[PDB]
């Protein structure tokens, strides 16, 4: 996609960036590797649209990141033994009141979601500060902007699996696997730890730019892709294990197919 790229460059050259235009471009086509972190940052409001203010704001963010890192070290909550994702978890927890009594106190179910997304972000975003900031904002969007939609997604999944392949849904129901499907993996962690980040990022392009329905179509798509192997599985036990641990090499295809599906069922607008 060059000309996908040129068309994006022409938007990025505006003194004030069109947030709404950057959104619909992301919904329509995938972001080129070299501009992904930048667009996500603008869309998650980590850089203001006003192009000049970038360095001024990036400073504040870097300085805050360092201050917070240091404070965590002063207390015993992080050390250099600490992995980057746990570091972001504590930074988030600090900046939000919610920091546990000690670093050993066990991890509450939502913390593990943060960890999951953060580990994935690490592979998508090189800079350590951008990475923190995007993870913090990404997760914050699930807890606010999508707070009401996310619990509706398991239903949507059944609605759309059905139109695409009824028999498979029936088979899921017959094995009483439908209530045992790994929904949190799909709609809490948005597929972090499930799809290789090189493809997951194209899904997140959409999540970042305002759509969480796309998540449903990745789920439907994972099922269509492994229709044959799943219809062969008798226990609900066997089904859940498989969907927790899916073969990796089809993912490029799953994600593109998923995006198509979602357009087919929902559509999206035009871009120069």
């Amino acid at each position: 996609g060059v000309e996908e790229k040129k068309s994006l460059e022409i938007l990025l050259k505006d003194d004030r960036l069109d947030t709404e235009k950057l959104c619909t471009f992301s919904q329509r086509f995938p972001l080129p590797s070299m501009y992904r972190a930048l667009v996500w940052k603008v869309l998650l409001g980590i850089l203001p649209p006003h192009h000049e203010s970038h360095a001024k704001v990036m400073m504040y963010r870097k300085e805050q990141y360092l201050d917070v890192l240091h404070a965590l070290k002063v207390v015993r909550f992080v050390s250099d033994a600490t992995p980057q994702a746990e570091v972001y978890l504590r930074m988030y927890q600090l900046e939000s009141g919610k920091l546990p009594r000690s670093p050993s106190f066990p991890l509450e179910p939502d913390d593990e979601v943060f960890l999951a997304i953060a580990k994935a972000m690490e592979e998508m975003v090189e800079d350590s500060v951008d990475c923190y900031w995007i993870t913090r904002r990404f997760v914050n969007q699930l807890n606010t902007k999508y707070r009401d939609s996310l619990p509706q997604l398991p239903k949507a999944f059944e609605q759309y699996l059905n139109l695409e392949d009824g028999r498979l849904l029936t088979h899921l129901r017959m094995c009483s696997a439908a209530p045992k499907l790994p929904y949190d993996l799909w709609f809490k962690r948005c597929f972090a730890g499930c799809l290789p980040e090189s493809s997951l990022q194209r899904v997140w392009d959409k999540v970042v730019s305002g759509s969480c329905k796309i998540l449903v179509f990745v789920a439907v798509e994972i099922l269509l892709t492994f229709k044959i192997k799943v219809m062969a599985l008798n226990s609900a036990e066997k089904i859940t294990k498989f969907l927790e641990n899916i073969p990796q090499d089809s993912s490029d295809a799953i994600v593109s197919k998923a995006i198509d599906l979602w357009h087919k069922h929902c559509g999206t607008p035009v871009h120069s």
Partner: protein, 53 residues
Amino acid sequence: QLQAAESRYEAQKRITQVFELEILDLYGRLEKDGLLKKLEEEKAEAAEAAEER
């Protein structure tokens, strides 16, 4: 940008509340055995009186 810096100050106060608790915690732990040695660190400093003097 207003929000970006205001954000940090908030983090700054956040930082100090954490540090506060640690401090109150560490005092507690040292309290298990009399902080008296703290009362020695004190006199001795006042003893650092003549020293200076």
